[PDB]
Amino acid sequence: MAVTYNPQTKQFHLRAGKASYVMQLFRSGYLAHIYWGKAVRDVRGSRLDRAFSPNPDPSDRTFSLDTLPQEYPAYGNTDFRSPAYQVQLENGSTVTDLRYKTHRIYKGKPRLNGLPATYVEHEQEAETLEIVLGDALIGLEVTLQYTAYEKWNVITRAARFENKGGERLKLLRALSMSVDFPTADYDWIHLPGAWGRERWIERRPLVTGVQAAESRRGASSHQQNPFIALVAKNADEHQGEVYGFSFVYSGNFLAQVEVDQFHTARVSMGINPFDFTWLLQPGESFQTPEVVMVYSDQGLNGMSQTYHELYRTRLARGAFRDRERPILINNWEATYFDFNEEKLVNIAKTEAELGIELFVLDDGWFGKRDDDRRSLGDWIVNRRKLPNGLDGLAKQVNELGMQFGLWVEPEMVSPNSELYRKHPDWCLHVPNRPRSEGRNQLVLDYSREDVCDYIIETISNVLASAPITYVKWDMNRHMTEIGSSALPPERQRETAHRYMLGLYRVMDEMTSRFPHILFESCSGGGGRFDPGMLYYMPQTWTSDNTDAVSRLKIQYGTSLVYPISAMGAHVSAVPNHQVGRVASLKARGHVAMSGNFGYELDITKLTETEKQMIKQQVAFYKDVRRLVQFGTFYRLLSPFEGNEAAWMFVSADRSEALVAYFRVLAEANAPLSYLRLKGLDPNQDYEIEGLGVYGGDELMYAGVALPYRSGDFISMMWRLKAV
Amino acid sequence: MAVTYNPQTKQFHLRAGKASYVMQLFRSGYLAHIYWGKAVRDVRGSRLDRAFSPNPDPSDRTFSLDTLPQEYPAYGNTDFRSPAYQVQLENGSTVTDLRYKTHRIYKGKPRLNGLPATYVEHEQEAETLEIVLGDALIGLEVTLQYTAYEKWNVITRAARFENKGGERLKLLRALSMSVDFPTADYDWIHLPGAWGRERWIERRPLVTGVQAAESRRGASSHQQNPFIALVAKNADEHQGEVYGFSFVYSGNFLAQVEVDQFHTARVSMGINPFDFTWLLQPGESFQTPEVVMVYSDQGLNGMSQTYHELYRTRLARGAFRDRERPILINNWEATYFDFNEEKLVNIAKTEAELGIELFVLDDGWFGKRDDDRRSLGDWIVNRRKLPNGLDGLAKQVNELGMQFGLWVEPEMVSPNSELYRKHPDWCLHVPNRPRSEGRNQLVLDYSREDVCDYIIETISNVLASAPITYVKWDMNRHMTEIGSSALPPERQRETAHRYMLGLYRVMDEMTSRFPHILFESCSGGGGRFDPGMLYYMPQTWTSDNTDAVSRLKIQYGTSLVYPISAMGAHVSAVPNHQVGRVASLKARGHVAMSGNFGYELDITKLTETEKQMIKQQVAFYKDVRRLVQFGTFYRLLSPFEGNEAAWMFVSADRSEALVAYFRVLAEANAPLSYLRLKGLDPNQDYEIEGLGVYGGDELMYAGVALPYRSGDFISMMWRLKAV
């Protein structure tokens, strides 16, 4: 929180939790990066003169922008490294020369225009530094925005551009931050994946050159999550230096590390410059989304725990932010599309009898929507299928003791829909080109006000028509032929970002209009599982893959950044679907109860003993839900490192914990296995259900001797309680 | 220190410093290993039943000795793993069946018969547990001896055998300890080397099978130091679990890790069973040397710092244990053998003028000794070369202000010596076989009382003849044709160990007879640099290789176990000898001043500017000597991991430190380098000579920006002092 500027040293010192982030003004208004790491009281701000690194000041051959470590570097006036931003002028030049002009420090944390951002509830929680840079010749101002939190090791960064000149300025690249580390002796971690296998942890040594994760899909994507980290060579889950970079944005991104000839590592992150430009007319401004930067010297768990608390309590919003989330059941595979009102209610009684709390109605309740082909965009209740509308169904579900929820997919329109026939120009498209389809549908142009107003109107008409208290908001394709008939040629490349701004406006309006609704975002599973979406909808469908073994990796990687409260995990029926696997009902429960728990099956196909297990799972999860959704989460064993996965949840006072252990392909006649715990009070004794009493110190330093077992999938869960 | 036995659980809990070591009685008197690691309040003592692991008790098929983790396992009655001991009976059987009989706990730490051992100065410093095992059938008793120190994470272990039966028992193997770890998820470290390159650190993953370091040389050896460690996969110098095993013995050793089919790691260490037996007649006993076991969760530096303090203060002995050690100069290469009294004295004035404190007289002062060929064993002053004997030379050296020291090599005899002609049977030999030579000399049979008495008499005659206050005790070959004409056939294989017992008796007598003499052991450099020798002579010549670059590795590895106070390091003249290298006088000083400092050159060949550097080095080392020899030592950068080496010494109160940095083959136009320090007070500010003032926190968390330099060998040293 404690942000200072020392006029003698011209140094900015941002103290965030137990971390320091230090910058310093250098020569004629350059802004240098000095340090970011464990908190220091002070740090004083060599060899900037290097062969083939040229001199911006002919009178001063002591430095180059090619060697000075910076906060917001440009290319073209002596730095040859990857720039944080680039601007093209009317004369075609791309040379810009920002210098420090002034700064201000204030308590609290500002909102970002049109954008999600971490926030504070009290000014005392953080302090913000704004450093105003300017290129006087062209009238370009860039304000670097920094916030340091008191309680957490969190620095947040963004940049705001403003054209204070009399000419057009075209932003070709506008990243949210850039930081030059003094060495490149780190591994990097990022989170690549695909549909059905999101956010695998990938750790790699750095190369001398560039390495990056990005999305060009108009959505943050299944393929790369907008998160990267630099980690010390020897750092692991429990110890060591880790620097995380998390982009609070749900569209295209670039997350990059470039290592230069002097083995310094430039980390940068922001809206993907690929296929992007932004035109600033005189007087216009551009605000980047923010990047949330976390430091820990307590390994990956230390970093994750920071993100979890920050994101759960100061990014997610609304009535359910700090509330236990309902155990839900999705009633899709009960019917695919095949539905009408008579079934649904008895089904709801069966589900209610098992203790399930929320009944969700899936796709095909609307219009002529009856495969992945039709009526998207026409959001009126198909009053054949539900003649009594949503109201009659919902109210009965409520009188059964369950909440009622609904699926929507408002960003899509079917070529065969009334909306498309009335307004074909309302989809993203480019002149004279075929309109490529994903799952037989097109993308609505949310860069347009009329489109957004129409969606707000139409979805509100549905949501206010029944006592709905949960909505799953799905988006099931990525953008092609990106353009808008409502933008001029010179702004066409703003389409993807304006689309996201439009979606953000729409979601902000929808969640405000319906404060009693828990919204869960979805994009073919976890295709937009990012901090930007979390600001609008406090939980997310983690993956369409609900296979127990597959979920071990998906949940483990997702937890690197995202709080368990946001991480949807459901028990589904087997034969599994994406993969093909058979694991016990017990086992799938064990994996799913390690997330935000729910069900995704046909209850009409269950044996009494199965429903009986489900009744027990539900009762069990209710007992540990506060611990799972709000406790401190520790990863113990990594499925990316072998055949085991293990993790645990610990209460704030360390008096209670829940431990989960998994092993795949356990061999015959195998060595005994052990599990060392973390996060307990070493001087406290704990009762482990079914295993007796152990010292916290015994559990952490010697570990639990795991009951010997062998088989295709071992799954164990234990509750711990201080004696 | 705090050693307890719980009669309800039958558990022994040894608390040493911040570590726990736990054992438990099991079934019919078996003794199981339970735990060794970070201290716990309690730890409770699966699947011992395994295919092809047979049952010692036919009435109880729940366990095998092949699966039970043990403290002192035997082979032959169901354990198929490597045994700690083995005994052959008169009937030719090798089956023995030790079971627990009784135990005792007492304060303090016993001496070991005939052997060096760590000790206490007050009973409160440690507590000792003796567990008495017995095989009633044969009357074999084995007492397992354990000591736990209060202040340090140190458990020491040895075993004492006694034949309480009426038959002969032949010990085929008598290791000092054995411990079964529950997993093998560790790397091991050991210290292989050769003459001129001792104690390189080698870290390797474990194999499923056996891996071991050993010596068969009758001396602990240059080739393998008697030290091994198990370290966590991610452990490094600064963090992580490390288990060290250091053998307090200077002869043959085996240090072994055997990993079995269930991936448990059995670590064992003791006198090498190879070519060894020990016959116990009825009523006879055998005491093993001890193994000093250290645990740390603070990485290799934590472990080393424990050994350094333990060994410097509670293993080394005598008047100089806690005393700053003299800056010496060896006057060999001034003359090789070419000497007489006139030179020596003026030389001593020159050396005294430079501030050097101790004048040492090397080989060839005795008999007809004038190459590596003659007169060894005839220890009378060759009163041609020194007509006024040692007394006149010594007394003049003293009046010049320097102490006087001498080289001896009492374990060797030349075939061309009077001793050999009078007593040819006094060398180690076997009947009717050629007597192999190393450097033209034979090994005296120190297993013989007459030999040992003769050496004590003869060396005492020399040492009491002059005011000598330093002796270098050298041994320049290894044993071949090991045998003694004074032992019967059935005891021939006891020769190597009895030799070492003899040497130990001789050294104990010699150091007691001459309490004003600082003794330094030597064996072609660091060929017997082990804790056994340290108990007798408080410092050791680290290596014959005095090349600055070579010494980086040798000193770094030696410091893993041995205190800097014991680690001789001298500046020598260049062209270097073993290798061929040219490094600055400054550079060689920097490496040597990081040990127990001295000189090894011809002062008659020095330029005024050189002597002037030497005068300055001497003054400098005097200023930091207490810090170097007695401060806490931290390794920072490893020459086994790249081209840098770095380390530092910190005073007990953290107010002062000395930092040293080295880099070989620094490339042109290189990245800037940094050095993070350790062991300082983060809230204190420190002045670094020549670099200004820094916070302790800045120094440790951000590090020192190293003055950019490039060249073949970079060498830097800084003094730090709290402001």
Q: Which residues of B touch A39 (CB under 8 A)?
A: 697, 701
Q: Find the radius of gyration of the CA atoms of chain B.
A: 26
Residue type, B651: S
Helix axes B341-353, B389-399, angle to 10 degrees: 20
| Whole-number Å distance between alpha carbons of B453 and A540 | 86
Helices (H), A318-369: 341-353
DSSP secondary structure letters along B243-270? EEEEE--SS-EEEEEEE-TT--EEEEEE
Amino acid B322 reads D
Report the distance separating Cα A358 and Cα A352, nearest Å. 9
Distance CA B189, CA B561 (A): 12
Helix B608-630 × helix B585-592 angle, to 10°: 20
Q: How far apart are CA B41 and CA B200, in angstroms?
A: 38
Q: Largest alpha-carbon pair distance within chain A?
A: 86
Dist CA B147 CA B31 (whole Å): 17
Distance CA(A523)–CA(B147), nearest Å, equals 63
| Residues of A annotated catalytic, as ranges | 474, 544
Query: Can you read off the two tokens belonging to residue B609?
Result: 């500017």
Please name the member of B44, B263, B702 whose beta carbon is closest to the beta carbon of A43. B702
Q: How do beta strands A328-330 and A596-600 pair? A: parallel
Distance in angstroms (rounded) separating the CA atoms of residues A300 and A201: 12
**Cα–Cα distance for residue pair B289/A469, rounded to 1 Å:** 76
A652-655 LR contacts (CB < 8 Å, sep 24+): A654/A679, A654/A680, A654/A681, A654/A684, A654/A696, A654/A722, A655/A684, A655/A721, A655/A722
Closest CA to B249 of B532, B562, B535, B534: B532
On chain B, the residues whose CB falls within 8 A of the CB of A669 are: 50-51
Which contacts of A51-55 are long-range, i.e. CB under 8 A and separated by 24 or more positions? A51/B669, A53/A78, A53/A80, A54/A78
Cβ atoms of B199 and B278 within 8 Å: the answer is: no
Residues of chain A with Cβ-Cβ distance to B183 below 8 Å are: 671, 674
> Comparing C-alpha atoms, which of A157, A155, A153 is closest to residue A142?
A157
| Sign for the pseudo-dihedral over CA of B193, B196, B201, B205 | negative
Q: How far is CA A481 from the centre of its chain?
A: 26
Spatial distance between the Cα atoms of B603 and B597, rounded to a whole number of angstroms? 16
Amino acid identity for residue B554 in this structure: I
Task: Specify the resolution in Å.
Answer: 1.8
Phi then psi for A451, rounded to 5 degrees? Answer: -60, -50
A 10 A CB-CB count for A359 gives 28
DSSP assignments along A191-235, one per residue: EE-BTTB----EEEE--SSEEEEEE-SSS--SSEEEEEEEEETT-
Best probe of the A interface among B301, B697, B704, by most A CBs < 10 A, is: B697
- What per-residue string of b and e applies to A395-430 under the rule 16 or more CB within 10 Å gives b? ebbbebebbbbbbbbbbbbbbbbebbeebeebbbbe
Is A297 marked within a binding site?
no
A581, exposed or middle or buried, with CB in 10 Å at 0-12, 13-18, 19+? Answer: middle
> Is omega for the bond preceding A575 within 30 degrees of 0, making it cis?
yes
For residue B336, give the amino acid letter: Y
Six-digit token pair at B28?
Answer: 């019919």
Per the entry, the structure determination technique was X-ray
What's chain B's length in residues? Answer: 723
Residues of A in contact with B234 (CB under 8 A): 234, 236, 239
- C-alpha A425/C-alpha A447 separation (Å) is 12
Instruction: Give B156 to chain A, closest Cα distance, Å.
Output: 21
- Flag whether B439 is marked binding: yes
Phi, psi (deg, nearest 5) at residue B298: -110, 35
Cβ contact A46–B705 (<8 Å): yes
The Cα angle at residue B658 between residues B655 and B664, in degrees rounded to 5:
155
The C-alpha atoms of residue B135 and residue B164 are separated, in whole angstroms, by 10
Torsion, CA A426, CA A429, CA A435, CA A436, rounded to 10: -110
3-class SS letters over A654-716: CCEEEEEEEEEEECCCCCCCEECCCCCCCCCEEEECCCEEEEHHHHHHCCEECCCCCEEEEEE
Tell me the CA distances in angstroms from B425 to B374, B480, B482, B503, B604, one per residue in order. Answer: 18, 15, 13, 18, 44
Evaluate whether A441 touches A419 at the Cβ level (below 8 Å): no
Among A339, A389, A380, A379, smallest CA distance to A362 is for A339
- Rounded to whole angstroms, the Cα distance separating B199 from B595 reads 15
Running DSSP on this structure, what letter comes out for residue A524?
A: T
- From the list A91, A94, A74, the residue with the least C-alpha distance to A83 is A74
> What is the CB-side half-sphere exposure of residue B557 using CA atoms within 13 A?
32
Residue of chain B with shortest Cα separation from A259: B671
Q: CB–CB of A81/A260 below 8 Å? A: yes
Task: List CB contacts of A93: < 8 A, sequence separation 6 or more.
Answer: none
Structural contact between residues B210 and B82, judged by C-beta atoms closer than 8 angstroms: yes
Tokens at residue A48, please?
A: 């900037």
- Measured distance CA(B543)–CA(B201) in Å, rounded: 15
Closest CA to B374 of B339, B338, B414: B414
Nearest CB to B672; choose among A46, A51, A670: A46
How far apart (Å, rounded) are the C-alpha atoms in residues B139 and B169?
9
Please write down the HEC assignment for all residues of B327-387.
CEEECCCCCCCCCCHHHHHHHHHHHHHCCCCEEEECCCCECCCCCCCCCCCCCCECCCCCC
Token readout for B327 is 């800056």
The answer to whether A412 is a known ligand-binding residue is no
**Distances from the Cα of A552 to the Cα of A197, A226, A301, A712, angstroms:** 10, 20, 17, 14
Residues 6+ apart with CB under 8 A from A469: A358, A403, A404, A405, A516, A517, A518
Task: Find residue A12's DSSP bridge partners.
Answer: A5, A23
- Which DSSP symbol is given to A641? S
Structure tokens, A680: 């307990």
Q: Side-chain half-sphere of B482: how many Cα atoms within 13 Å?
A: 24
The candidate with the shortest Cα–Cα distance to A410, out of A450, A446, A448, is: A446
Instruction: For residues A667 and B387, give the distance between their C-alpha atoms in angstroms, rounded to a whole number.
Output: 81
The secondary structure of residue B54, as a DSSP letter, is -
From CA B185, how far away is CA B263, in angstroms rounded? 8
Catalytic residue IDs of B: 474, 544
CA distance B262 to A669: 8
Other Cβ atoms closer than 10 A to A620: 16
Q: Specify whether the CB–CB gap between A555 and A568 falls below 8 A.
A: no
* CA of B59 vs chain A CAs: smallest distance (Å): 23
- Helix ranges (DSSP H) in A326-415: 341-353, 389-399
Q: Which two tokens stand for residue B198?
A: 């001792």
Let me know: does B146 contact B229? Beta carbons within 8 Å.
no
CA B231 to chain centre: 20
Query: Tokens standing for A340?
Result: 């009408």
- The C-alpha atoms of residue A236 and residue B241 are separated, in whole angstroms, by 14
As to burial, measured by CB atoms within 10 angstroms (0-12 exposed, 13-18 middle, 19+ buried), residue A541 is buried
- Cβ burial B90-105 (10 Å sphere, 16+ → b, else e): eeeebbbbbebeebee
The tokens for A650 are 């610990």
Smallest CA-to-CA distance from A682 within B37, B361, B123 is with B37
Concatenated DSSP letters of B567-626: EEEEEE-SS-SSS-----HHHHHHHHTTSEEEEES-GGG--HHHHHHHHHHHHHHHHHHH
Q: Which backbone phi and psi does B460 adopt, to 5 degrees?
A: -60, -40
CA-wise closest residue to B294 among B135, B570, B531, B566? B531
- Cα distance between residue A137 and residue B548, in whole Å: 58
Local structure of A11: helix, strand or coil: strand
Contact A398, A373 (CB under 8 A): no
CA–CA separation, B374 and A204 (whole Å):
62
Q: CB neighbours (10 Å) of residue A106?
A: 13
Distance between CA A389 and CA A408 in Å, rounded?
A: 16
Report how far residue A165's alpha carbon sits from residue B251's, in angstroms, rounded to the nearest whole number. 85
Chain B residues in contact with A263 by the CB 8 A cut-off are 671
Alpha-carbon distance values, A207 to A69, A180, A723, B668 (Å): 19, 15, 51, 20
The contacts of residue A696 (CB under 8 Å, 6+ apart) are A654, A680, A681, A682, A683, A684, A685, A686
The strand pairing partners of A477, in sequence order, are: none
Cβ-based contacts of A241 with chain B (< 8 Å)? none
Of the partner residues A37, A236, A262, the one whose CB lies closest to the CB of residue B702: A37
CA-CA distance, B314 to B518, in Å (whole number)? 17
Rounded to the nearest 5°, which phi and psi values hold at B566?
-90, -10
The first and second tokens of residue A664, run together, are 């795949």
Q: What is the token pair recorded at B501? A: 């017992």
- Can you name the residues that pair with B438 across neighbouring β-strands? B441
C-alpha dihedral (A544, A550, A552, A557), degrees to nearest 10? -70
Strands A169-181 and A265-270: antiparallel
Neighbour count for residue B213 (Cβ, 10 Å): 22
Q: Is A260 annotated as a binding-site member?
A: no
User: For tokens 């509330």, what's the residue?
Assistant: A323
Rg over alpha carbons for chain A, rounded to the nearest Å, is: 26
Q: Which member of A51, A182, A672 has the closest CB to residue B674?
A: A182
User: At B329, phi and psi to the nearest 5?
Assistant: -130, 130
Task: Please give the domain boundaries of chain A with CATH numbers for all domains.
Answer: 1-305 (2.70.98.60), 306-628 (3.20.20.70), 629-723 (2.60.40.1180)
B427 is in an annotated binding site: no
CA-CA distance, B41 to A723, in Å (whole number)?
Answer: 15
Q: Is the dihedral of CA B624, B626, B627, B629 positive or negative?
A: positive
The angle subtended at Cα A290 by Cα A286 and Cα A295, nearest 5°, is: 150
Closest-CA residue of B relative to A22 is: B702
Residue for token digits 């010692």? B56
CB contact under 8 A, A183 and B671: yes
Q: Do A263 and B671 touch (CB under 8 A)?
A: yes
Residue B4 amino acid letter: T
Burial (0-12, 13-18, 19+ Cβ within 10 Å), A488: exposed
Contact A354, A625 (CB under 8 A): no
User: What strand order describes the sheet that includes A30-38?
Assistant: A2-6, A11-16, A19-26, A30-38
Tell which residue, B188, B133, B137, has the closest CA to residue B167.
B137
A591, containing H or E segment: helix A585-592
Number of A to B CB contacts under 8 A, please give it.
90
Burial (CB < 10 A; 0-12, 13-18, 19+), residue A534, is buried
What does the block give as tokens for B135? 């095989």
Ranges assigned E (strand) in B433-481 = 442-443, 470-474
CA B45 vs CA A680, B12, B22, B185, B627: distances in Å: 21, 10, 9, 21, 45
Residue type, A398: N
Residue of A nearest to B683 (CA): A41
Q: How far apart are CA A451 and CA A457, in angstroms?
A: 10
Is residue A439 part of an annotated ligand binding site? yes
CA distance A651 to A632: 6
Residue B314 to residue B354: CA distance in whole angstroms: 34
Strands B202-205 and B285-287: unpaired
Cis check for the bond before B575: say yes or no (omega within 30 of 0).
Answer: yes
CB crowding B354-393: b at 16 or more within 10 Å, else e: bbbbbbbbbbbbbbebbeeebbbbbbebbeebbeebbeeb
| CA distance linking residue A410 with residue B559, whole number of Å | 68
User: How does strand B154-163 pair with strand B169-181?
Assistant: unpaired
Q: A95: exposed, middle or buried (C-beta count within 10 Å: 0-12, 13-18, 19+)?
A: middle
